[PDB]
Design an enzyme around this catalytic site. Structure first.
Site, mmCIF file in Angstrom:
data_model
loop_
_atom_site.group_PDB
_atom_site.id
_atom_site.type_symbol
_atom_site.label_atom_id
_atom_site.label_comp_id
_atom_site.label_asym_id
_atom_site.label_seq_id
_atom_site.Cartn_x
_atom_site.Cartn_y
_atom_site.Cartn_z
ATOM 1 N N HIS A 4 0.883 -1.234 -0.001
ATOM 2 C CA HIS A 4 -0.053 -0.141 -0.082
ATOM 3 C C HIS A 4 0.982 1.250 -0.098
ATOM 4 O O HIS A 4 1.361 1.681 1.073
ATOM 5 C CB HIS A 4 -1.017 -0.024 1.189
ATOM 6 C CG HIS A 4 -1.941 1.077 1.242
ATOM 7 N ND1 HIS A 4 -3.290 0.763 1.183
ATOM 8 C CD2 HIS A 4 -1.777 2.393 1.121
ATOM 9 C CE1 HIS A 4 -4.064 1.949 1.177
ATOM 10 N NE2 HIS A 4 -3.071 3.010 1.323
ATOM 11 N N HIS A 38 2.006 4.936 -2.595
ATOM 12 C CA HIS A 38 1.322 6.128 -3.610
ATOM 13 C C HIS A 38 2.831 6.707 -4.277
ATOM 14 O O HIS A 38 3.738 6.984 -3.447
ATOM 15 C CB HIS A 38 0.633 6.976 -3.255
ATOM 16 C CG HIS A 38 -0.760 6.537 -2.384
ATOM 17 N ND1 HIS A 38 -1.967 6.403 -3.250
ATOM 18 C CD2 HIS A 38 -0.780 5.958 -1.013
ATOM 19 C CE1 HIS A 38 -2.834 5.734 -2.152
ATOM 20 N NE2 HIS A 38 -2.072 5.734 -0.869
ATOM 21 N N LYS A 92 -8.577 -0.999 -5.691
ATOM 22 C CA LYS A 92 -8.667 -0.251 -4.179
ATOM 23 C C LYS A 92 -10.124 0.393 -3.941
ATOM 24 O O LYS A 92 -10.482 0.849 -5.086
ATOM 25 C CB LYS A 92 -7.619 1.028 -4.557
ATOM 26 C CG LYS A 92 -7.671 2.011 -3.305
ATOM 27 C CD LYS A 92 -7.460 1.356 -1.855
ATOM 28 C CE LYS A 92 -7.435 2.551 -0.934
ATOM 29 N NZ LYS A 92 -6.413 3.372 -1.326
ATOM 30 N N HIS A 110 -9.399 0.717 2.109
ATOM 31 C CA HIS A 110 -9.121 1.826 2.996
ATOM 32 C C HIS A 110 -10.178 1.872 4.268
ATOM 33 O O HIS A 110 -11.514 1.537 3.689
ATOM 34 C CB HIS A 110 -9.482 3.441 2.296
ATOM 35 C CG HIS A 110 -9.255 4.605 3.215
ATOM 36 N ND1 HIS A 110 -8.032 5.530 3.298
ATOM 37 C CD2 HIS A 110 -10.552 5.181 4.033
ATOM 38 C CE1 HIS A 110 -8.678 6.491 4.353
ATOM 39 N NE2 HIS A 110 -9.535 6.224 4.880
ATOM 40 N N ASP A 124 -4.463 1.322 12.665
ATOM 41 C CA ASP A 124 -5.106 2.719 13.268
ATOM 42 C C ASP A 124 -5.892 2.303 14.440
ATOM 43 O O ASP A 124 -6.295 3.420 15.212
ATOM 44 C CB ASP A 124 -6.052 3.432 12.108
ATOM 45 C CG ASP A 124 -5.279 4.418 11.211
ATOM 46 O OD1 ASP A 124 -4.216 4.438 11.521
ATOM 47 O OD2 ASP A 124 -5.744 4.695 10.239
ATOM 48 N N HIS A 180 0.034 1.852 7.959
ATOM 49 C CA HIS A 180 0.182 3.298 8.527
ATOM 50 C C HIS A 180 1.280 3.392 9.536
ATOM 51 O O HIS A 180 1.302 4.298 10.528
ATOM 52 C CB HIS A 180 -1.047 3.870 9.076
ATOM 53 C CG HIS A 180 -1.806 4.282 8.206
ATOM 54 N ND1 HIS A 180 -3.396 5.099 8.491
ATOM 55 C CD2 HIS A 180 -2.031 4.872 6.812
ATOM 56 C CE1 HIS A 180 -3.831 5.639 7.518
ATOM 57 N NE2 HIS A 180 -2.948 5.567 6.367
ATOM 58 N N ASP A 235 2.325 3.602 3.253
ATOM 59 C CA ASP A 235 1.110 4.338 2.691
ATOM 60 C C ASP A 235 1.877 5.866 2.450
ATOM 61 O O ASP A 235 1.300 6.967 2.937
ATOM 62 C CB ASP A 235 0.015 4.589 3.831
ATOM 63 C CG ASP A 235 -1.128 5.221 2.955
ATOM 64 O OD1 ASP A 235 -1.385 5.189 1.667
ATOM 65 O OD2 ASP A 235 -2.050 5.778 3.728
HETATM 66 C C1 LIG Z 1 -4.037 9.996 -0.822
HETATM 67 C C2 LIG Z 1 -4.219 9.603 0.326
HETATM 68 O O1 LIG Z 1 -4.331 8.047 0.653
HETATM 69 P P1 LIG Z 1 -4.712 7.363 1.981
HETATM 70 O O2 LIG Z 1 -4.083 6.097 2.255
HETATM 71 O O3 LIG Z 1 -5.990 7.423 2.122
HETATM 72 O O4 LIG Z 1 -4.239 8.424 3.123
HETATM 73 C C3 LIG Z 1 -4.812 8.717 4.387
HETATM 74 C C4 LIG Z 1 -5.135 7.302 4.991
HETATM 75 CO CO LIG Z 2 -6.224 5.319 2.596
HETATM 76 CO CO LIG Z 3 -4.920 6.446 9.946
HETATM 77 CO CO LIG Z 4 -3.184 5.358 0.696
#
Ligand SMILES: CCOP(=O)(O)OCC
Ligand SMILES: [Co+2]
Ligand SMILES: [Co+2]
Ligand SMILES: [Co+2]
Ligand SMILES: CCOP(=O)(O)OCC
Ligand SMILES: [Co+2]
Ligand SMILES: [Co+2]
EC number: 3.1.8.1
Lengths: 323, 327
Positions: free
Chosen positions: A21, A23, A135, A167, A199, A220, A263
């Site tokens: 995960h 970006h 996703k 997510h 989280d 995260h 992430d």
């Molecule tokens: C571009 C945002 O990606 P995300 O993984 O949703 O970040 C906040 C959890």
């Molecule tokens: Co996210």
């Molecule tokens: Co979070």
């Molecule tokens: Co993300």
């Protein structure tokens, strides 16, 4: 035995250490093309991405799964460019996150299924690059549209073998409703990753989903704002508290159900202006945080290298392999 | 006397009969490129656009102003392709409509001003094609973000001379709040068009804006859902007022001496993805003439009612020329 990447098909063994995960850029559809100056320039963003991917590569990473959907502003041409320059495989994604425009949000489940299938079976835009993951997202109880997206993701997965990654608002226990919707569609839990699961501190919730066969996305780990807009996004829980959840699930016997990631991103336009500068100061390691900080932390806590190689190489390979 | 089009700079006299509020495709940012199959194919959409603009040119149209913004899915490359193939000038737009994504809606007024200026002074994307109009929107009372867009549009207009055109919920009298925000920034009324103004029969609202120097966008003339009252989605978008009732508002403003303040258009499109799926097929059956509805049906309607030819030529040629000219 092939996985589709932005540079073409690769074998299971070529994937290696995979971050599930990530970006390259967290943006919006058409944004990078319309306003590249927001990120300095497209060249500045591409160069930053190549350096960050090279840092991750030197730390052991061989593949990253860019879970940027259409509405996160996925620019597969940029992914292909940085993948080539950095010698890191990048798996692209289809699906929808929580910023769908009118042209997406007014669509039926049948139409969304056609779209997700188009990106997996034909290609993304006019590039020929095929998505290797779907996703989806919920931020609490699923809205009617989010339920349609989850169903379309399940239908696209069942027709292709491509996995679904999510997510969640882990504190609101979204994984339970996501699981219920996926199962109602006949989707196998082994094809689903319940993301942002670190989280929460509720271990019984994570253990219950892992027992059903779901992959738990503890993605995260470096997101911690210990010491305004950054405090509401990253949180007040330490990376150590988040990393101990990996150990806790291994101790419960669910090492094969764990997926770890950062992430991370190199550009971030879908939040406040100087957020990328704040994030880079919080975690200078970037995508290299998992192999440089989390793996040695788990090694000193008693977790074997055979288990850690299982979590970072074997689990993503089994997850990404079209089944 | 130079205006920017998708084919490059042209002189004011070359514009001719101009439709001030049109679209090649009503979509969303990146949608056409990601899912062209929604419109059959990009080739099918392009060919439909060329056929429609050719039919419009045969009827008298020489220029259309495509008010599609970033969030309406403006694909300038498509606009350029169809402009060249149909030999019709197309003015592109910058600004933001009512569906901005997160990367746009979290921006400050200064950042939005720089984006609008980039599309007018440098170019759209990597095409070099410059915008010649700024499109903004409100659907009732302006949201805090829409106020920032209106202010940024005004600041971009004052720095370039390029005009501003709006989407309104005419029944809620949005033009008054829009006008008040534009004037608080120092923008001249002569550089602004209050669009979708024919959606209301409130002549007092229309004449008051026209008296201040505002251009009145009577751009929804063929939009009618009479006969299809059982279709909720089409009724909510197009309304239940006839084209004649909408066209009589052009005559009403001429009779009251506001000839120089009228801008007429169709608000037509060849692809429509930002609403329900069947909408383009529904709309094409309501108005088979498309963008050719203004010179074919509306001009001879006003001619039989007593309106002179030079008055109609002044509305279709002179008014858009004065409006589009960067001053
Ligand atoms: C571009 C945002 O990606 P995300 O993984 O949703 O970040 C906040 C959890
Ligand atoms: Co996210
Ligand atoms: Co979070
Ligand atoms: Co993300
Ligand atoms: C996509 C075009 O949106 P609009 O012109 O505001 O509405 C036309 C009915
Ligand atoms: Co409009
Ligand atoms: Co319009």
């Amino acid at each position: 035995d092939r996985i589709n990447t932005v540079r073409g098909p690769i074998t299971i063994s070529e994937a290696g250490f995979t971050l599930t995960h990530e970006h390259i850029c967290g943006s919006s559809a058409g944004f990078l093309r319309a306003w590249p100056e927001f990120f300095g320039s497209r060249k500045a963003l591409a160069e930053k991405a190549v350096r960050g991917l090279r840092r991750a590569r030197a730390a052991g990473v061989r593949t990253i799964v860019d879970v940027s959907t259409f509405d996160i502003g996925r620019d597969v041409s940029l992914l292909a460019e940085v993948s080539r320059a950095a010698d890191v495989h990048i798996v692209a994604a289809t699906g929808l996150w929580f910023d769908p425009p009118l042209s997406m949000r007014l669509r039926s489940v049948e139409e969304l299924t056609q779209f997700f299938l188009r990106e997996i079976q034909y290609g993304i835009e006019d590039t020929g690059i095929r998505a290797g993951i779907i996703k989806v997202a919920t931020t609490g109880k699923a809205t009617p549209f989010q339920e349609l997206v989850l169903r379309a993701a399940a239908r696209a997965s069942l027709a292709t073998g491509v996995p679904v990654t999510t997510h969640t608002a882990a504190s609101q226990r979204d994984g339970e409703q996501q699981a219920a919707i996926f199962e109602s569609e006949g989707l196998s839990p082994s094809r689903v990753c319940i993301g942002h699961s670190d989280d929460t501190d509720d271990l019984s919730y994570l253990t219950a989903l892992a027992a059903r066969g779901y992959l738990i996305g503890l993605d995260h780990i470096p997101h911690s704002a210990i010491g305004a807009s950054a405090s509401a996004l990253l949180g007040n829980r330490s990376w150590q508290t988040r990393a101990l959840l990996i150990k806790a699930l291994i101790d419960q016997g669910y090492m094969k159900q764990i997926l770890v990631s950062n992430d991370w991103l190199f550009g971030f336009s879908s939040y406040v202006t100087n957020i990328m500068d704040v994030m880079d100061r919080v975690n200078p390691d970037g995508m290299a945080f998992i192999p440089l900080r989390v793996i040695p932390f788990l090694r000193e806590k008693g977790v074997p290298q055979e288990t850690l190689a299982g979590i970072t190489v074997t689990n993503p390979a089994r997850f990404l392999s079209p089944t």
